[PDB]
């Protein structure tokens, strides 16, 4: 049943902030009735501060917007050890007043960001402290992960090679977006040239309502959070979908007759419409979840998938021969006024586990190398009670996750 959510980081709160709006619209909540069921954590006030003021003052009981007040770092170490340490407790307490406000949830949608103030490091220690206190539950993190070129910091590389080992072993399944790869979509398929961190967030707020939210409206052939952990993993390692959503188009490429079921599904495999610069052309897929929602009738799907099943550019991997799932829900997506998608009638979120993400792992491992290769920027981390270890071991580690996501290709 319903399911707490933790946004940590400059980013993560913004992501929330859109996303939480949509929700509330979705069930027809005003800006007041019941009360949201999640938390926002950060070491630097200003972001959360907007939230305390802008409409939606009400609609959180103010316990749960925990904000630090000291620095935000911008550098893991500090955020993990040193500063952040102070806040931990106090956060940890709310979700434990919040766990026991409700029965039988399944997990924690984390949204935390792989650059931002807090929030490699911090998250690192959070997902870790949850993992011991709630060893059982499900931990889906939607993380935002830094583009192959459009980096905006000079320690994106340090933070993200530090993060992997903390998320690898402790979050169940970690979703990836990247900012850069989102940009195309807004330009071409939607047709705006203003895509702020605020537009993209309106977008991810849609891909999330289709996992969870929507499942909770119960439709016809329903899929569920455990299911994943069976159907998308296929081994131990925390494996990582990439997300894709399907009919993205704007409100006057709307008129070009229906979006057939058949189409939208086909439109996903198109490596110019996914979300993470990677392109699946030489990836092998290994597992999909196509969740449809709106008027999609099982048969339709169960035909359209057949076509794909034979398209042969697109490779499934040998040692699986199956691999699908289908979500059909009702509830036809709902459309946030200050957003930009059409009144569609059905859309399709296929997320799927691919050896293509061998790509994404590369760039950052590469970037990093250059910088570590001199030592360069080290002193901001060393000096925060974080070590020379953590550098070496979080590369050597992540390399050795990267040979697995290749090896589990192709070898039958």
């Amino acid at each position: 049943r319903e399911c707490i959510s933790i946004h940590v980081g400059q980013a993560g709160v913004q992501i929330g902030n859109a996303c939480w709006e949509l929700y509330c619209l979705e069930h027809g909540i005003q800006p007041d009735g019941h009360v949201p069921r999640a938390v926002f954590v950060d070491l630097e006030p200003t972001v959360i501060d907007e939230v305390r003021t802008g409409t939606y003052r009400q609609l959180f009981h103010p316990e749960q917007l925990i904000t630090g007040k000291e620095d935000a770092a911008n550098n893991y170490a500090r955020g993990h050890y040193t500063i952040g340490k102070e806040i931990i407790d106090l956060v940890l307490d709310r979700i434990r007043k919040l766990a026991d406000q409700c029965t039988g949830l399944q997990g924690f949608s984390v949204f935390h960001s792989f650059g931002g103030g807090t929030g490699s490091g911090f998250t690192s220690l959070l997902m870790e402290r949850l993992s011991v206190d709630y060893g059982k539950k499900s931990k889906l993190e939607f993380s935002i992960y830094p583009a192959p070129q459009v980096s905006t910091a000079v320690v994106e590389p340090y933070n993200s090679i530090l993060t992997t080992h903390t998320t690898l072993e402790h979050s169940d399944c970690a979703f990836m977006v990247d900012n850069e790869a989102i940009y195309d979509i807004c330009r071409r398929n939607l047709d705006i040239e203003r895509p702020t961190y605020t537009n993209l967030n309106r977008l991810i707020g849609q891909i999330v309502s289709s996992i969870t939210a929507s499942l909770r409206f119960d439709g016809a052939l329903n899929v569920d959070l455990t299911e994943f952990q069976t159907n998308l993993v296929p081994y131990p390692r925390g494996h990582f979908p990439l997300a894709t959503y399907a009919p993205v188009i704007s409100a006057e490429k709307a008129y070009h007759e229906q979006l057939s079921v058949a189409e939208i599904t086909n439109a996903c495999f198109e490596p110019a419409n996914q979300m993470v610069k990677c392109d699946p052309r030489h990836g092998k897929y290994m597992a999909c979840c196509l969740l449809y929602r709106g008027d999609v009738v099982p048969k339709d799907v169960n035909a359209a998938i057949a076509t794909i099943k034979t398209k042969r550019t697109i490779q499934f991997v040998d040692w699986c021969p199956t691999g699908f799932k289908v979500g059909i829900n009702y509830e036809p997506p709902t459309v946030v006024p200050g957003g930009d998608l059409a009144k569609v009638q059905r859309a399709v979120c296929m997320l799927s586990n691919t050896t293509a993400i061998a790509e994404a792992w590369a760039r950052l491992d590469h970037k990093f190398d250059l910088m570590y290769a001199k030592r360069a920027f080290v002193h901001w981390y060393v000096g925060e009670g974080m070590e020379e270890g953590e550098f070496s071991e979080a590369r050597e580690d992540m390399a050795a996750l990267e040979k697995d996501y290749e090896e589990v290709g192709v070898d039958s």
Binding site: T82, R375, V382, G383, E388, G389
Partner: protein, 130 residues
């Protein structure tokens, strides 16, 4: 013979100990607001070797930040072994801890080990009339 014997090739070893170090390694170190515990015990060990009275991190920043930190190191006595009791102190205090352990520190920063090697030399030569 023309030898001293007692710790002899330790004082030709302790000699590498001073010739290792590089100023830029200090400059980064002295900037470190709160480096790991592995740094911290080593710096308490230098402070004793130079014979500042014992300290703790806050105080140590205030001390190390000085102009003459690096200068005193470069100006120091490699041939000192003249009756410090800092030997029996440092041993009761530190050479009895296996976390005062070469490796941990040896990875620790760049060249923190060479500094540990330097301290170690200042102890293991201080065994001079044992």
């Amino acid at each position: 013979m023309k030898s001293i014997q007692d710790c002899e090739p330790t004082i030709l070893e302790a000699q590498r100990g001073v010739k290792n170090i590089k100023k830029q390694q200090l400059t980064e170190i002295r900037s470190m607001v709160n480096p790991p515990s592995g740094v911290k015990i080593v710096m308490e060990a230098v402070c004793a070797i130079l014979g500042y009275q014992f300290s703790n991190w806050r105080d140590i920043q205030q001390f190390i930040r000085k102009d003459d930190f690096i200068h005193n190191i470069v100006h120091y006595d490699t041939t000192l072994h003249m009756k410090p009791q800092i030997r029996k102190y440092m041993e009761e205090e530190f050479l009895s801890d296996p976390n005062f352990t070469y490796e941990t520190i040896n990875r620790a920063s760049k060249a923190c080990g060479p500094l540990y090697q330097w301290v170690n030399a200042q102890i293991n030569f201080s065994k001079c009339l044992e």
